[PDB]
């Protein structure tokens, strides 16, 4: 019911930050090429310097405070 | 009740320059004029040093125009005030957020046209009072009151661009800051100093001395096999660049978009 | 029982300036004059060297503009007195924080408005007593007595800047500290020296000797084909700076933002 | 009864140590957006140069010399 | 039985000053005037090299009352005495622990009120004898005898600053060590060395000689391209200041909040 359900966040480097049209032509071409069943399987090409993922959730969610409820 | 011309509301995107103005205001209502650019040159003078021809006006304005267009793209600013006629599409989750949109240039002066169409038919026009904006992130969002994307459904039209600061050593957020001027005659100031750079003495001459009769001088100037004449005051040009550049950054902010 | 002016309670936010004076302050009352400027430059003069003109007080006033505000952008601070019209959003974890809220300039001198909104009708304006402020920080919090989010509910008016100091050595949280009037002039500074650099001897001068009859002498000067007639004075500056800026970034602290 | 009960220390690096205004103000920003059930999952955002969390005791406490006892 | 002012207990919090004398009380009573930074610079002698002008005692208040903040900010103190208007949130652990409170400014020289209010009137204000303080680090404790939080509930006054000392070689807690103040000279002496430096030798001049009709004359300044002509002692003095601060750190110790 509220937020902090992100998986994590993925870091590109670059000299000078890219403007917001580049990346909404980015996010264009992430959608149409991968998002849903659709293009599912597939694998994006990137060549900039240097990428990361940053983690901020755990692999896998489950319930907390299980024995203390019981 | 409210008085308001129909497409601007004083509460959420109050009207801040009238249409008609655009064409008017230009580079030297901001104060890049050619005169401040040689202010910041004092005791220097630029001339051919074959004739008594100093670098006209054209010349400075012309670089001063490429200058605010480098200060354009070194921070993803729109500058001048312009009109932009811009479709965007659907994306459902920013839709659901209130119908939320970033201007691919910012900052915003004000909004004239919020409208939806599925054919050029425009099929729901929202009203005025409905649409609020955050001026200086571009941010357009909407409130009502009483597959998962498609392309260009929706159309915007706005104002981008900042105004000329009205009250000394302030500025609103729809209005320029000071250091945005000093960065773009900076940047004027390293192509002129390019070009003065290499008219000290002769061309290509590091150091000379004559003797003539008993009549001796010696002159060694500031070009160098490895620098040049004027790498000087680029160097501090660019020393001052760098903070002033980097300072301003924090005002603005990183971008984001989601994916 | 207690007298005060509605907007201005002496608990939480007193009054500090009056609104008409906020035109009536500037760069003058702080002590950025010219005179400061020269002080700091005793026995030095600077003038065109194929004239007998010293630069006048406007330039002098242009670059302490621009340095204060490149002041105003190393740190995230506003300056001078202004008034403010701002609009936020509504965040439920902070509106349920007792209506928290961090004003996007600081320091506050004082908060003339604080309202919720709807269409532009208020639908409820706070009693003064209620609400109370942090000056620096610029905090806003709400004291009541007897989707998760939404755009632009709230809205806040308040005045942001700091008042001259009254008294020697010392300054209240709301009243501008010596350093900030002492960094400013060293930002003003750098531009002059940057001026006053290369006026030494003629243009692109390093070295000179003449001979003439018996007659001879010689200099050499602070130029180089690497380094500039100033830079020693530049270095300086930039090394007296890097402590005064991160020493008074220790008096605001960093920033936060919840997400 | 006693203290030790610390489950770590929250370093941040910094060339001058803050002002105790600053890290009051500081506080308060913490309590308001993150304390309690409000506001619980969000995630705070810091800028500064480094940042470092050194734990003080286990992940999980537990009762010692259980078998000594027995 | 015990005679004392309401305010002041000699028991946690005994008086120390006078709450007039904050007035009386200014630079020149610690040591602070120009005659300690002329004699510091014995032997050297500053002046217009166009003129027989040396420069005036307002220069030196003006560099020392801006050197004394630089010290007030690179070490959080409130150094020369004055009165504080103080209000601060309820934090339930530390109003638990005594009522903890830990001042904003320090050292503490005295406390004259502490209360608690809801809306300007004060719920409840303690008797005299209950409150404890530690002057060096602020803390103000108490001690009666015989949501989580909330915003600006408690209100406290109080003065902050340092007396000048009494006697020779030392200094009480509440009391001026006498590092400040030979601190508070150096960092004088940095701007006046940064001032002095540029007289030496005309302008910008690093090397000289004549040589006319047999009389020959040779001079080579510190100045140089790289550094400037009192960079020397500006380094001497950056070493000694990172040595003397450092040293004074450990006096007061390191900050901390619990979050
Ligand atoms: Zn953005
Ligand atoms: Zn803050
Ligand atoms: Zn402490």
Redesign the interface.
Known sequence: ????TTRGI?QIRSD??????A??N???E??SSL??INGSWQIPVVMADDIKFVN?TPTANDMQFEKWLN | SLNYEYPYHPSGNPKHIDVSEIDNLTLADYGWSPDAVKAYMFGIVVQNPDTGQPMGDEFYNHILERAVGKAERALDISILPDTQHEMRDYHETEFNSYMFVHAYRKPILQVENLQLQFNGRPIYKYPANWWKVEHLAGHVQLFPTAATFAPQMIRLEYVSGMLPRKKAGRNKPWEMPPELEQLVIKYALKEIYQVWGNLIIGAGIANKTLEVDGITETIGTTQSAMYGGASAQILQINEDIKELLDGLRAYFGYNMIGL
């Not at chain 1, 019911?1 to 902090?4: E, I, P, R």
């Not at chain 1, 000078?16 to 049209?21: D, E, R, T, V």
């Open positions: 019911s509220h937020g902090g993925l000078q930050q890219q403007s917001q049209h990346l909404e980015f996010k264009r992430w959608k998002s849903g901020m």
